[PDB]
Amino acid sequence: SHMIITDVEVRVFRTTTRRHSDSAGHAHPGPAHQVEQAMLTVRTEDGQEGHSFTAPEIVRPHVIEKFVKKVLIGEDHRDRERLWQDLAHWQRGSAAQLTDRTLAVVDCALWDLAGRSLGQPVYKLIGGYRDKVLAYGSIMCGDELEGGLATPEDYGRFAETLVKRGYKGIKLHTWMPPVSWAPDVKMDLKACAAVREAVGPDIRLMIDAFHWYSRTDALALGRGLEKLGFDWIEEPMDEQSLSSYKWLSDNLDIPVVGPESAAGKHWHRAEWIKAGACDILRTGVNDVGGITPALKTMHLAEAFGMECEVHGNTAMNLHVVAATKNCRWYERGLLHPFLEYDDGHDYLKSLSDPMDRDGFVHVPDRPGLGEDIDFTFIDNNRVR
Amino acid sequence: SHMIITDVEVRVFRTTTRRHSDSAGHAHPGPAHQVEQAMLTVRTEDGQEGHSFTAPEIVRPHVIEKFVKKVLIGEDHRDRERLWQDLAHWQRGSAAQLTDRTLAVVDCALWDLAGRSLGQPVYKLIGGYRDKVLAYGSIMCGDELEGGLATPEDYGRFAETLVKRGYKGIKLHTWMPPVSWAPDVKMDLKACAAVREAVGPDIRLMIDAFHWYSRTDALALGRGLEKLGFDWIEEPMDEQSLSSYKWLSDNLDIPVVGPESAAGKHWHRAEWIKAGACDILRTGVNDVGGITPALKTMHLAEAFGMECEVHGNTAMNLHVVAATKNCRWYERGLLHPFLEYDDGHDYLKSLSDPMDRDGFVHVPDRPGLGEDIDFTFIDNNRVR
Numbered sequence: 001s002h003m004i005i006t007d008v009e010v011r012v013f014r015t016t017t018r019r020h021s022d023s024a025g026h027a028h029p030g031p032a033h034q035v036e037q038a039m040l041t042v043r044t045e046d047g048q049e050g051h052s053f054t055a056p057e058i059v060r061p062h063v064i065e066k067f068v069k070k071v072l073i074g075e076d077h078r079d080r081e082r083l084w085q086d087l088a089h090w091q092r093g094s095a096a097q098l099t100d101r102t103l104a105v106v107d108c109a110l111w112d113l114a115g116r117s118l119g120q121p122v123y124k125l126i127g128g129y130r131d132k133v134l135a136y137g138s139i140m141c142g143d144e145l146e147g148g149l150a151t152p153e154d155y156g157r158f159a160e161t162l163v164k165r166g167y168k169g170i171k172l173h174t175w176m177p178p179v180s181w182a183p184d185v186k187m188d189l190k191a192c193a194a195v196r197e198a199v200g201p202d203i204r205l206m207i208d209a210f211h212w213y214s215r216t217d218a219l220a221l222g223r224g225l226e227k228l229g230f231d232w233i234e235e236p237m238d239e240q241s242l243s244s245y246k247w248l249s250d251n252l253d254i255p256v257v258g259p260e261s262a263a264g265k266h267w268h269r270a271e272w273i274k275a276g277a278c279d280i281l282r283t284g285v286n287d288v289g290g291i292t293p294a295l296k297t298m299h300l301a302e303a304f305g306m307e308c309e310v311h312g313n314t315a316m317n318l319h320v321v322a323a324t325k326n327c328r329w330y331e332r333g334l335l336h337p338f339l340e341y342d343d344g345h346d347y348l349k350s351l352s353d354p355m356d357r358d359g360f361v362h363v364p365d366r367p368g369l370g371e372d373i374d375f376t377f378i379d380n381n382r383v384r
Numbered sequence: 385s386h387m388i389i390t391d392v393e394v395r396v397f398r399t400t401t402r403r404h405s406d407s408a409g410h411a412h413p414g415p416a417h418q419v420e421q422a423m424l425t426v427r428t429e430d431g432q433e434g435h436s437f438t439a440p441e442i443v444r445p446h447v448i449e450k451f452v453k454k455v456l457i458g459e460d461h462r463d464r465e466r467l468w469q470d471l472a473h474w475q476r477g478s479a480a481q482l483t484d485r486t487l488a489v490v491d492c493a494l495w496d497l498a499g500r501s502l503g504q505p506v507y508k509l510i511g512g513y514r515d516k517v518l519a520y521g522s523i524m525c526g527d528e529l530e531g532g533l534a535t536p537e538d539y540g541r542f543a544e545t546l547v548k549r550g551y552k553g554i555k556l557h558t559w560m561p562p563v564s565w566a567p568d569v570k571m572d573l574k575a576c577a578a579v580r581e582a583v584g585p586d587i588r589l590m591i592d593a594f595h596w597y598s599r600t601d602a603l604a605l606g607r608g609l610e611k612l613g614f615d616w617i618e619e620p621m622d623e624q625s626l627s628s629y630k631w632l633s634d635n636l637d638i639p640v641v642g643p644e645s646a647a648g649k650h651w652h653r654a655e656w657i658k659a660g661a662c663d664i665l666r667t668g669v670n671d672v673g674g675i676t677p678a679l680k681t682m683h684l685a686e687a688f689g690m691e692c693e694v695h696g697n698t699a700m701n702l703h704v705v706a707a708t709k710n711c712r713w714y715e716r717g718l719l720h721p722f723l724e725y726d727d728g729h730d731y732l733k734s735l736s737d738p739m740d741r742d743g744f745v746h747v748p749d750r751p752g753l754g755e756d757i758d759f760t761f762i763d764n765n766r767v768r
């Protein structure tokens with residue numbers, strides 16, 4: 001009975017960061033401040049543990065007591081498919097409180113537990129494809145900060161810096177409300193043009209613009225991009241409208257990648273394939289409810305001969321990318337000229353995603369998700 | 385470097401069995417005789433091993449030297465996705481000699497190696513869904529043996545015996561060439577009717593008839609089955625004709641399950657979904673080239689809200705079934721009144737798929753594929 005789960009614990013602590021998020025949830029650099037972060041730990045009878053990080057609200061007591069403990073406590077931690085399906089089955093009746101985000105953090109902690117228990121990196125447990133992978137530099141949403149990301153030329157200048165660092169691909173997130181004047185298709189296209197001019201024709205370029213443009217605006221945006229040789233256009237319209245995506249992909253030459261944010265996990269992504277709503281699939285550990293369903297989406301895409309690009313940084317997504325073939329990149333970011341991504345986080349002793357000078361991220365040879373957790377730091381900065 | 389593969393070995397030995405196969409490859413009971421069986425072993429630097437069984441021609445020296453050793457030797461055994469993809473990439477150019485069957489046995493040996501090395505059953509490594517699963521009794525193709533499977537009533541009588549044993553579902557394979565008079569739709573339907581009459585309405589019944597009936601014959605067969613409340617009709621036409629399956633499923637009420645034998649692995653099975661060629665998907669470790677692609681097919685089906693029924697017995701298929709939710713059964717057989725399935729194989733010390741009196745197969749709690757291999761027997765019966 002050593003593999004039986006005995007405890008599920010949440011520890012909330014303060015991390016020091018210059019990352020802020022606006023009222024619409026878009027990241028920006030700002031003053032150094034303390035932000036509450038949560039760590040979920042699952043422990044078995046023999047004392048082995050697995051951990052994963054998320055925002056405090058996602059693993060608050062209501063959700064832990066009503067849902068997570070009831071599924072996990074007393075169960076064999078290795079039964080990840082059974083445990084995931086049990087949580088999935090309870091979402092419909094949860095009064096909207098048991099979210100895909102909660103499933104993701106629980107599933108990730110279970111994977112970390114298995115890996116740490118076995119002394120194996122998660123991607124090796126899954127079945128490894130690659131130990132290193134090209135990353136694109138994923139640039140934060142636009143701002144109104146002088147010298148930051150306020151003008152089209154600001155994007156161009158930051159792009160030059162990213163190429164020097166070794167990134168072989170660059171993705172722009174452009175300007176979005178509550179930036180006062182946003183959104184503006186002409187401004188987005190000017191940023192795209194400035195970046196292409198700055199880096200030349202051989203760096204791969206992507207755009208993830210305002211996520212709710214009308215069909216007419218997204219068509220104008222996509223048309224403007226075809227002149228610049230961009231690799232993909234990402235979520236330019238409300239992803240709840242599958243029909244809009246069928247229409248847009250039919251009317252654009254540039255590949256459309258999606259859905260990133262849409263609900264329904266791997267099931268809904270099958271619908272995007274069936275309906276021809278995208279040219280490249282998208283998934284992400286946080287978006288589909290864990291490593292387990294992310295892997296399902298990767299396999300789904302592969303069976304159709306499609307790529308499936310993995311949204312988001314951190315170990316959980318990196319291990320999905322390392323375990324699969326049909327994904328061009330790891331998404332490294334979000335990045336901003338004012339911030340030093342390579343410095344990492346105060347609660348981790350080293351980076352989960354170190355990148356060489358040629359633009360390859362190397363998966364750490366550490367067990368589980370391989371997050372090098374500074375438990376002492378967390379203990380010293382607990383939220384009472 | 386303890387995880388690095390150092391050796392790939394094939395040991396051919398004689399097993400004593402009453403299973404024969406006719407000229408078309410269909411199994412039948414006959415005289416006790418000795419049949420050559422091959423065991424593939426993969427070994428790492430630290431001396432850990434994994435094993436899998438297949439027919440000698442599938443792992444003959446030509447294939448081992450030209451393909452398998454070149455991919456595996458010197459590589460990290462845990463990189464199953466990379467190694468599978470490397471073998472897949474070499475099939476096209478192999479002058480038809482590197483088959484999906486060869487990929488399957490190699491992939492299975494790699495999974496067994498990881499499980500044995502970690503002390504974990506393969507389904508627990510994948511992420512377990514169930515430790516036991518309902519099995520259907522899968523009846524051998526028809527014969528002309530008196531009291532065997534020669535008449536419709538013979539099927540009825542054997543069905544009664546299987547229900548007593550505890551099977552909750554039963555699948556008929558009916559009469560096929562070179563049975564002198566075969567095939568005959570009317571005879572197949574008589575067997576189906578005899579079985580339904582024998583077992584009543586609450587036992588689940590399936591039919592896997594002659595695999596190459598015309599559209600007109602398969603329509604007549606399927607129409608006759610709807611009167612008997614059968615759960616599915618399996619491969620009644622040449623599976624190379626996707627279009628025939630679209631047509632047949634459109635014209636039958638009874639669910640069509642497939643494709644079992646078609647080439648193209650998980651990719652081709654996506655096409656069956658996209659085209660609406662079946663109501664229930666089919667896969668199998670031997671049919672799609674290993675546990676790795678079988679899992680991909682399971683996930684593909686699940687994303688469409690479909691079941692995917694796993695073809696074939698033995699540990700390799702049982703572990704796929706135990707790791708996934710969207711499959712109703714393990715296929716236990718093939719069975720015949722003249723043969724005692726529960727006696728197992730002379731080269732295994734116990735059954736990979738023991739079944740209780742309620743019709744549940746219990747996955748052995750043994751590492752890797754959990755095949756309880758009698759190495760001494762194999763050594764004593766080697767083919768010189």
Ligand SMILES: [Cl-]
Binds near residue numbers: 060
């Ligand atoms: Cl709460």
Ligand SMILES: [Cl-]
Binds near residue numbers: 335336340342
């Ligand atoms: Cl940076």
Ligand SMILES: [Cl-]
Binds near residue numbers: 342351353354355
């Ligand atoms: Cl770095």
Ligand SMILES: [Cl-]
Binds near residue numbers: 373375
């Ligand atoms: Cl520490």
Ligand SMILES: [Cl-]
Binds near residue numbers: 444445446447
């Ligand atoms: Cl040979």
Ligand SMILES: [Cl-]
Binds near residue numbers: 723724
């Ligand atoms: Cl039997």
Ligand SMILES: [Cl-]
Binds near residue numbers: 737738739740
């Ligand atoms: Cl048994």
Ligand SMILES: [Cl-]
Binds near residue numbers: 759760761
């Ligand atoms: Cl032995």
Ligand SMILES: [Mg+2]
Binds near residue numbers: 208234311
């Ligand atoms: Mg995005």
Ligand SMILES: [Mg+2]
Binds near residue numbers: 248250254
């Ligand atoms: Mg298009």
Ligand SMILES: [Mg+2]
Binds near residue numbers: 349
């Ligand atoms: Mg740090």
Ligand SMILES: [Mg+2]
Binds near residue numbers: 592
């Ligand atoms: Mg069959």
Ligand SMILES: [Mg+2]
Binds near residue numbers: 632633636637638639
């Ligand atoms: Mg139908």
Ligand SMILES: [Mg+2]
Binds near residue numbers: 727729730733734
């Ligand atoms: Mg035996």
Ligand code: NA
Binds near residue numbers: 209234236237
């Ligand atoms: Na977007």
Ligand code: NA
Binds near residue numbers: 275276277278
């Ligand atoms: Na399209």
